[PDB]
Amino acid sequence: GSHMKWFNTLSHNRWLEQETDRIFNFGKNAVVPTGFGWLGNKGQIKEEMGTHLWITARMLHVYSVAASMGRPGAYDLVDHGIKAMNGALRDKKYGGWYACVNDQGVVDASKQGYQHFFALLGAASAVTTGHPEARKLLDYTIEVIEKYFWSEEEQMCLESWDEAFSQTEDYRGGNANMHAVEAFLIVYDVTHDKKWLDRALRIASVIIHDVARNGDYRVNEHFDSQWNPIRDYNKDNPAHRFRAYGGTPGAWIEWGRLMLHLHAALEARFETPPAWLLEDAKGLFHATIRDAWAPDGADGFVYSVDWDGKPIVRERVRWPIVEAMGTAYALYTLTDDSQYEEWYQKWWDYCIKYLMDYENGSWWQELDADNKVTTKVWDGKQDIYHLLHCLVIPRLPLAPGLAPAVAAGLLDINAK
Amino acid sequence: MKWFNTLSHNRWLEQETDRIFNFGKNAVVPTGFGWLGNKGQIKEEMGTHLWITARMLHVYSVAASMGRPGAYDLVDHGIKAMNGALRDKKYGGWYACVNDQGVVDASKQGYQHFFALLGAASAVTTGHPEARKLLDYTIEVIEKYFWSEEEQMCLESWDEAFSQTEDYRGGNANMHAVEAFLIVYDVTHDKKWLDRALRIASVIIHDVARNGDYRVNEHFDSQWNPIRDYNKDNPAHRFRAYGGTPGAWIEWGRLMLHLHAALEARFETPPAWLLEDAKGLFHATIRDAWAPDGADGFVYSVDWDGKPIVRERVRWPIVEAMGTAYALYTLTDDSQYEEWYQKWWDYCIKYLMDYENGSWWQELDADNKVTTKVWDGKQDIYHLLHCLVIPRLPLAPGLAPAVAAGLLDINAK
Amino acid sequence: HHSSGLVPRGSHMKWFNTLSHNRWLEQETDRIFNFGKNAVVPTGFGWLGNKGQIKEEMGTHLWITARMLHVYSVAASMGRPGAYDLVDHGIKAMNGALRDKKYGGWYACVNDQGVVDASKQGYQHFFALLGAASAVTTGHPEARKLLDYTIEVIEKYFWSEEEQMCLESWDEAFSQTEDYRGGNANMHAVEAFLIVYDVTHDKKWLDRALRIASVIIHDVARNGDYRVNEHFDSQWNPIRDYNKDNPAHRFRAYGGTPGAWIEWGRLMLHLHAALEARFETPPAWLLEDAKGLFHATIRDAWAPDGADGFVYSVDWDGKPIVRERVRWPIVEAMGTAYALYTLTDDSQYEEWYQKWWDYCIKYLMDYENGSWWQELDADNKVTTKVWDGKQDIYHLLHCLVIPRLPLAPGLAPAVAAGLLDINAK
Amino acid sequence: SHMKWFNTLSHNRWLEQETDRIFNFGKNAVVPTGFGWLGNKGQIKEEMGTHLWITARMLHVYSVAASMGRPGAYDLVDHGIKAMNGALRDKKYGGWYACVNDQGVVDASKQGYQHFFALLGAASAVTTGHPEARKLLDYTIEVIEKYFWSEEEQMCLESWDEAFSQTEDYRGGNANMHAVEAFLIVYDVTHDKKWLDRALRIASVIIHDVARNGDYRVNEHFDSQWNPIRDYNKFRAYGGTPGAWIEWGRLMLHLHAALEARFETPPAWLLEDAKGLFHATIRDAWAPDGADGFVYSVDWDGKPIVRERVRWPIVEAMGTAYALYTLTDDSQYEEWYQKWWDYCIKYLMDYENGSWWQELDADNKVTTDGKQDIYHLLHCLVIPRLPLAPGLAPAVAAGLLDINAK
Ligand SMILES: O=S(=O)(O)C[C@H]1O[C@](O)(CO)[C@@H](O)[C@@H]1O
Ligand SMILES: O=S(=O)(O)C[C@H]1O[C@](O)(CO)[C@@H](O)[C@@H]1O
Ligand SMILES: O=S(=O)(O)C[C@H]1O[C@](O)(CO)[C@@H](O)[C@@H]1O
Ligand SMILES: O=S(=O)(O)C[C@H]1O[C@](O)(CO)[C@@H](O)[C@@H]1O
């Protein structure tokens, strides 16, 4: 009919900032002596879940952004995060970080690559605040990543180890490798050591440009030690929180945004990006809508699909649509194609209608196939890190990345 | 009195910038850029110099990003010249000087090769389709012959065939290496270019200059020991003056503040000596070389006691001083730096700016009357961007990248 | 839609919507305004030569007088002292010696002694309409009365309700109309109607503009590979061979005039933008055909003969006939590049704009004698063949002012509404 | 429609570029004793010597140029301050000789109107922060308070002999008007309210009492008891100088704006009388004789006497149009400003020989002593780019150029 304009309007960006403050305030209750706890549906700590590395590292990242946004108390949460990464979570005998601890000791002693890449992101985002211990934490995290999680032999990321780093898992994961790309982008932004961007491009070339593109942009996540897909992985456990059977369309559209951050990093240094970053980001965006948007007679993104693109887990988890909104912004920024803003607007309307929770705080984690609140895949409201991708990313250029851009004063730079 | 970051001052700067861009256009010759005389006509006897051709490529890259019609054509002409008669097809790199008949000076001058690197890196910011290929080639030549991994410093020069390197190491060539490396960093975001820049500055400024009351030693032997008496018999050399060249001291200061700004832009604490030594160089330049002989202006050279030797006021030292005043003001907010900038602007319009014949005079005598002694014509406009465009831009990224990124007047109201 | 003639680029050099480029444009605009001021004569605006002197032998043309009224309306809204006096002079000339007191409308040409050419030229009357509508944006107290009069003349003699198209010309007495229908007159009708719409919001002006474009572009031009047919008989059938014996005509060249093709493109994008400004989805053929015209203009007329520049005319196979580089075609091309960039965000249109700007300063701009050359030979050296002097500055606002403004409302309205550099940083 | 110029960046860019043309013309006036008298080709007329009023005005002009970021301007401020501390300065009796040259004193008289320009020049120079400016202002204030501001009359005196032994048996609107102009800027660089109190008092006597009661025809010539001399001279034209009427209007609006800037309700008569003066100036002096332009003087019936179009009256009219527009938002004031700009480029501006003509005949053709002033031109070139408070030099120094423009 005509173009309703939200992107780069101060009116929309004011609404985003005020929702951002609501989300920052919800996450503050997660402070526990050993790091950040697991928030439930009323913003209370679920003490039985203990202190997870992935949640502690994500909150360190989140409050780095909040601190650069000039929020009192955020810097204290960054300081608390860095103390936790130097304290109870840190394995003093073998190095790196336990997956989960509590006041009594270690709950899960395993060394999870997924969670270590979030440690790297958290440390790199914390660097943007100039916290005096942030750069030392990043340098240590880099040594752990290069010793145990980045393989020079495979030129890809490993998945996990036992406590003692004696045996690595006979498995390679798209999820851990995707969050490696995310962390590497920010490590690049705070080092300009080229190898971080080279590693990110290489990971995307293998998982997206080779495997995903050849399967109609259905991202394969599960691989053996020779980087062959395991198509049947977790067939008996399809609703796994991190390793769902088949395809996780939320992850496809997230890969898209990350490859546009890579594209934008190359353009920021006056370098023509390879054409496949934008072509594949478009392919992933359109595949996500083709297979996973309202495929079953109601609005929303399903959690998982088979290799034919037919839904398996039909629950609407929060993070897939949040990532979709981030990618819509990134594609709009690089194409000026108004279809991407229309999707962003449609998804915002769905989010306030079904996911946003003004009564109990933050957003619901999970809805059923009719978009009614449920508990099946998940349990509580333990994450706010994804929400910055629909609340803060649309206020920033695509280079440098989220925490660096906010710290460089770039919030609303393109808005009038 | 407020000039820095005012649109009124920056409008005056842009209008003078257009006058300078217009003057340089007449330097176009088939083999690159010629040597302009005092009326902006080509001095054909000087032929086509690599340093002038590379500098004009840089200048018209900035002009093109400023939206000036014709500038991009000059960028195109510059890149063709760097792929044409100046390029040594047998041994690689570039001849120092050519003309329409062939090679005039076949030597491989590091000073001039670092300007080739700056020119190629600035040209990349225009997106000219051959710029990146020229930069990649220039990088290979620099890393093969001019950056020494053994010394972690820049060599000076070679014969045509790259068979023997000069038994000499130079502050001047190493300073213009730092200048080029900053822009290579801005168009690669490969930290090794900034690591090299920091290392060069640590040796020439933080070690030697600081220990001599910030009187920069420029002349070294192959083991990086100072030759204090170098060119005693030829004190007014255009590139290697006897003793200290205070214009170079204050220029080193600005370059170290660009390095500082690059490190802060990626959330890295710059070493404290970049700002401390930039201040030391700025104050030493004023102490020894500003009105040291009973009249305003910066002398060309001083002895190791800081007393003038060549008392002629060459154009580029005061232009560089004005750039450094801006950079120090930007990092300190100390209004003494703006006072110096304003005082130097008043001197420049009174004695150096030439509205009748175009551009600025290259050289004045000890009473600030136009002269010919050290120099001959108006062959440079590259230095003028440091007092005309730099004060309109942040210190990171560098000049050509910042203009191309839309940052002109970003801090002004 | 991709044309030959650009080397692909490694990064985006940004000029459009930069205050640095727009400052360069404004300073060139002031140089052009200053050149036109010497054209003031008692009966209107004279014909300026290569040194900015009046060529008195050419007398006072309606088309030049009406164009200068339009130009100084823009200058007046830009806050230039003296411009409003030239608008006042223009309106007095349109109410004085040029005006036919017996039959109405305006003589084509007068001088201090009387009428030189008494004919009633539609081409020139549509410039009278544009001039009056642009003058309205200044609020000159006689402008609205001049527009109302001009509208009456246009609706009586030049817009045909029967054909739903514009007629070409009449004798002095409006007794017989020319056995000819012209793309050129109809194109400048569209241009004028856009501005009449902007100062009336009487829908019929935009309806008439859309209708004219639907016939000359969407029907005839599109079916001939976007080679605009300009010459028609009274039944609107093409006369393909028109002026075969007089191929270098200043207004009615034999075959196709690619400058006019790319100009049609920009006008259709002003029409598109007028519809979007009132929250109405424009028909898709306005943008599709503007792209077709832009790419056809480059295909047939850009550097077809071993040197840069736009040739004046091509035959129906796209073979150049008049190879001289006249000023206005590349100026219009630059305007259309801006309009297409604004609606597509396709950087190929900015690259063409930048390439054409580089050509203009190299070969057309005349800093020594003033303004720009009117005409170059096939090697881009100054010549005299099609034209004679520097009688026009109206086209130059399309590459100097249009790139500083939104596409709606039109040129004079947008400047008067404070929109200069609204999108620039 | 309204054609919009005021507060548009497009118009203000045209104004700044003309301002630079005017700054460049004045630079040739530098002589060792101060600022010389420029002729019609921008050459020094050496026979005219160094006038106090011209030297003080150029000090003011290059203070504005220096705050505008023009290289060379600050050197001219420094030169101006040195001239006010050198040969112009009476070392024996204090204040400044009216005219000197390289050899010595040409006119030793102590002219009030020229001393108030010395005060304006010193106050404008203070806004540059030149280290000798404040000392020059403090000295100038002492001379003004000793000899030119009368605590007894609460008005300004006109002139004295060299030795300050006898004051002239005359009181003038012109000296008192330029006192108001200087006092406004002294207020802006001291925030001592007494300068604004004195300005309001001067205006209350010359405008609110006498001018208002005579249909806003300002009486300029008074005896020592401040009674009008209507017949005087059957700088001191017989009858009314309408240029001065409209100038008084702008100055009272600067006074109004200074009071509003410190949250003080200005008396209603400042705006009412500025409007009265503006409309009286149009009524009697705009195109009163069959051709465009402002005549120089009129009789007490408002009929022209001296029909020459001098440059400064229309320049001041343009300043007042801006000030009235700023306080009323009445577009009639912008229409007058636009009409006067069109007249100025057509008849006064001289692109061939530089600057503007000083004087035209009754048919607006140039007529027959040079182009010795550029100070008035800032009132139509810079004032329309600034708020009405603080005043011209302070506002530019505070970064307020184009603050209201888009
Ligand atoms: O954010 S949570 O929803 O609590 C955890 C999810 O983050 C992802 O890696 C998405 O990229 C999922 O695999 C996790 O379940
Ligand atoms: O620019 S010129 O004056 O032509 C040359 C000077 O540039 C410098 O390297 C300064 O950075 C001098 O040594 C050259 O003479
Ligand atoms: O502007 S001029 O070159 O003098 C006249 C041209 O304008 C056109 O109508 C193009 O739109 C041509 O037909 C005229 O020759
Ligand atoms: O500026 S000049 O025209 O040279 C001098 C005039 O200034 C006034 O004081 C106007 O306010 C007049 O009395 C002078 O003649």
Distance CA B216, CA B205 (A): 7
Distance CA B231, CA B242 (A): 5
* Chains linked to D by 3 or more Cβ pairs within 8 Å: B, C
3-state secondary structure (DSSP) of residue B326: helix
Task: Give the atom of ligand 2 at the shortest distance from the alpha carbon of B251.
Answer: 11
Could you give the angle at which helices C143-153 and C83-95 cross, rounded to 10 degrees?
40
The C-alpha angle B306, B312, B317, rounded to 5 degrees, equals 70
Token output for D311 = 């440059």
Q: Considering only CB atoms, which chain D residues are within 8 Å of B12?
A: 20, 68-71
Distance CA B79, CA B73 (A): 10
Please tell me what DSSP assigns to residue D306. Answer: S
Distance CA D85, CA C375 (A): 62
3-state secondary structure (DSSP) of residue A108: strand
Chain breaks in chain A (C to N over 2.5 A) after: none
User: For residue A254, how far is its CA from the centre of ligand 1 (angstroms)?
Assistant: 11
Residue owning tokens 């009487």: C202
Please tell me what DSSP assigns to residue A308. Answer: T
Q: Considering only CB atoms, which chain D residues are within 8 Å of C137?
A: 1
A210's CB contacts (< 8 A; 6+ apart) are none
3-state secondary structure (DSSP) of residue D143: helix
Distance CA B127, CA C13 (A): 6
Specify whether the CB–CB gap between A244 and A304 falls below 8 A.
yes
The answer, yes or no, to whether any atom of ligand 1 lies below 6 A from the CB of A366, is no
Distance CA C300, CA C255 (A): 12
* Chains linked to A by 3 or more Cβ pairs within 8 Å: B, C
3-state secondary structure (DSSP) of residue A106: strand
> b/e string for B95-115 if b means 16 or more Cβ within 10 A?
bbbbbeeebeebebbbbbbbb
First-to-last CA distance in chain A?
A: 23
Nearest Cα of chain C lies from the Cα of B137 at a distance, in angstroms, of 16
Specify whether the CB–CB gap between A54 and A118 falls below 8 A.
yes
Distance CA A268, CA B6 (A): 28
Which amino acid would we find at residue D14?
W
Specify whether the CB–CB gap between A182 and A260 falls below 8 A.
no
- Best probe of the C interface among A2, A331, A414, by most C CBs < 10 A, is A2
Q: What is the dihedral sign for C-alpha B151, B156, B159, B162?
A: positive
Residue owning tokens 């008392």: B311
Contact A272 B404 (CB under 8 A): no
Partners of residue C106 on adjacent β-strands: C99
Chain breaks in chain D (C to N over 2.5 A) after: 234, 368
A198's CB contacts (< 8 A; 6+ apart) are none
What's the number of CA atoms in the CB half-sphere (13 Å) around residue D201? 16
Token output for B159 = 């014969």
HEC assignment per residue over chain C: CCCCCCCCCCCCCCCCCCHHHHHHHHHHHHHHHHHHHHHEECCEECCECCCCCECHHHCEEHHHHHHHHHHHHHHHHCCCCCHHHHHHHHHHHHHCCCECCCCCCECCEECCCCEEECCEEHHHHHHHHHHHHHHHCCCCCCHHHHHHHHHHHHHHHHEECCCCEECCEECCCCCCECCCEEHHHHHHHHHHHHHHHHCCCCCHHHHHHHHHHHHHHHHHHHHCCCCCCCEECCCCCECCCCCCCCCCCCCCCCCECHHHHHHHHHHHHHHHHHHHHCCCCCCHHHHHHHHHHHHHHHHHHECCCCCCCECCCECCCCCECCCCEEHHHHHHHHHHHHHHHHHHCCHHHHHHHHHHHHHHHHHHECCCCCCECCEECCCCCECCCCCCCCCCCCCCHHHHCHHHCCCCCCHHHHHHCCCCCCCCC
Distance CA B282, CA D162 (A): 51
Specify whether the CB–CB gap between C268 and C335 falls below 8 A.
no
Distance CA B316, CA B241 (A): 14
Contact D342 C82 (CB under 8 A): yes
Of C189, C323, C320, nearest to C263 (Cα)?
Answer: C189
Backbone angles phi, psi at B217, to 5 degrees: -80, 125
Which amino acid would we find at residue B79?
I
The C-alpha angle A264, A270, A275, rounded to 5 degrees, equals 55
Of D312, D355, D359, D376, which is best to mutate to test ligand 4, by the most ligand atoms within 8 angstroms of its C-beta?
D312
Partners of residue B105 on adjacent β-strands: B97
Distance CA B179, CA D137 (A): 47
D187's CB contacts (< 8 A; 6+ apart) are D193, D195, D196, D199, D258
What element of type H or E holds A286?
A: helix A275-292
Q: What is the dihedral sign for C-alpha C332, C333, C334, C337?
A: positive
Specify whether the CB–CB gap between B35 and B56 falls below 8 A.
no
Specify whether the CB–CB gap between B127 and B134 falls below 8 A.
no
CA-to-CA dists, residue D29 to D26, D37, D76, D121, angstroms: 6, 6, 10, 16
Of A80, A83, A90, nearest to A115 (Cα)?
Answer: A90
First-to-last CA distance in chain D?
A: 19
Nearest Cα of chain D lies from the Cα of B138 at a distance, in angstroms, of 39
A149's CB contacts (< 8 A; 6+ apart) are A113, A116, A117, A157, A158, A176, A180
What element of type H or E holds A223?
A: strand A222-223
> b/e string for C221-252 if b means 16 or more Cβ within 10 A?
bbeeebbbbbbbeeeeebeeebbeeeeeeeeb
**Cis omega before residue A273 (within 30°)?**
no
> b/e string for A157-182 if b means 16 or more Cβ within 10 A?
bbbbbebeeeebbebbbbbbbbbbbb
Task: Give the atom of ligand 2 at the shortest distance from the alpha carbon of B239.
Answer: 13
Residue D105 gets the label, from left (phi > 0), alpha (psi -120 to 50) or beta, of beta
Resolution in A: 2.1
D360's CB contacts (< 8 A; 6+ apart) are D293, D308, D309, D347, D348, D366, D367
Distance CA A34, CA A49 (A): 13
**Beta strand B313-314 pairing with B363-364:** antiparallel
Specify whether the CB–CB gap between A304 and A242 falls below 8 A.
no
Residue D158 CB neighbour total at 10 angstroms: 20
CA-to-CA dists, residue A398 to A268, A271, A331, A334, C112, angstroms: 9, 15, 10, 9, 66
Please tell me what DSSP assigns to residue A366. Answer: E
Of C101, C108, C90, nearest to C43 (Cα)?
Answer: C90
Partners of residue D171 on adjacent β-strands: D222
**Touch test D–C: 3 Cβ pairs or more under 8 Å:** yes
Specify whether the CB–CB gap between B379 and B36 falls below 8 A.
yes
What element of type H or E holds B388?
A: helix B385-388
Token output for A86 = 């130097």
**Beta strand C109-110 pairing with C115-117:** antiparallel
Distance CA D362, CA D347 (A): 12
Distance CA C126, CA C124 (A): 5
Distance CA C419, CA D9 (A): 11
Token output for A38 = 């697991």
Please tell me what DSSP assigns to residue A39. Answer: B
Distance CA C249, CA C270 (A): 28
Nearest Cα of chain D lies from the Cα of B27 at a distance, in angstroms, of 28
Contact C136 D11 (CB under 8 A): no
Chain C contact for D345 (CB, 8 A cutoff):
yes
Token output for B121 = 């890196």
Of B124, B125, B188, B127, nearest to C10 (Cα)?
Answer: B127
3-state secondary structure (DSSP) of residue A41: coil
Q: How many CB pairs under 8 A join B and C?
A: 58
Distance CA A259, CA A283 (A): 12
The domains located in chain C, with CATH, are 19-417 (1.50.10.10)
3-state secondary structure (DSSP) of residue B366: coil
What element of type H or E holds A136?
A: helix A134-144
What residues does ligand 3 touch, defined as CB less than 6 Å away? C 184, 250-251, 260, 263, 328, 391-392, 395
Q: How many CB pairs under 8 A join A and B?
A: 47
Backbone angles phi, psi at C135, to 5 degrees: -60, -35
Chain B contact for D342 (CB, 8 A cutoff):
no
Chain C contact for B125 (CB, 8 A cutoff):
yes
Tell me how the structure was determined.
Answer: X-ray
Token output for B335 = 């209004």
The C-alpha angle A374, A376, A382, rounded to 5 degrees, equals 80
Please tell me what DSSP assigns to residue D43. Answer: -
Could you give the dihedral angle defined by the CA atoms of residues B267, B271, B272 and B275, in that order, rounded to the nearest 10 degrees? -80
Residue owning tokens 């305030």: A25
3-state secondary structure (DSSP) of residue B36: strand
B385's CB contacts (< 8 A; 6+ apart) are B17, B59, B62, B399
C67's CB contacts (< 8 A; 6+ apart) are C45, C127, C130, C131, C392, C393, C394
Distance CA B397, CA B262 (A): 7
